[PDB]
């Protein structure tokens, strides 16, 4: 039905994302959003039948400013994921007030995810605009750009085309599947 490929021709397995996940994330992190504070979640799940299924939205211990969030205890996150056999399939965060895009920081953050898993996605929620989007870096070229980049500054720009929206249809398929939210904070 659908065969998806990277910019360099590599095949991308499907990620099934529960249709309710995005709203549910917003509900759970609402107290931070009210404070104009970003919140991050990890999209975790399993590989079955050559496809990935997001089963768990994991909210780690984290530090949030108005334009960054970052997990602060990677070990507790990684041990929770390993105890329950949960793969890392991508990540989701809010822009409480800004528009829907990937910031400089977002691109650097996503590069880890996508180097480990070519299918890895970044979901960005812009609740004050009622918009959202699912993104990824161009592979290889955007990944190359970000890895080579040494610029200082939280908001530094990037030369060239670096990231893109996941296409519709594409390797992400939204389905009516259940969701478990795990809050580790
Ligand atoms: Zn962001
Ligand atoms: Zn950079």
Swiss-Prot record:
Coiled coil: none annotated. The record marks 38 as: Indirect zinc-binding. It is found in: Cytoplasm; Endosome. Residues 14-144 form the MPN domain. Zn(2+) 1 binds at residues 93, 95, 106. Zn(2+) 2 binds at residues 108, 149, 156, 158. Signal peptide: none annotated. It comes from the Eukaryota. A motif (JAMM motif) lies at residues 93-106. Zinc metalloprotease that specifically cleaves 'Lys-63'-linked polyubiquitin chains. Does not cleave 'Lys-48'-linked polyubiquitin chains. Plays a role in the multivesicular body (MVB) sorting pathway. Required for ubiquitin-dependent sorting of proteins into the endosome and subsequent trafficking to the vacuole. May regulate MVB sorting through deubiquitination of ubiquitinated ESCRT proteins. Belongs to the peptidase M67C family. The JAMM motif is essential for the protease activity. This is AMSH-like protease sst2. The gene is sst2. The chain holds residues 249 to 433 of 435 of the full protein.
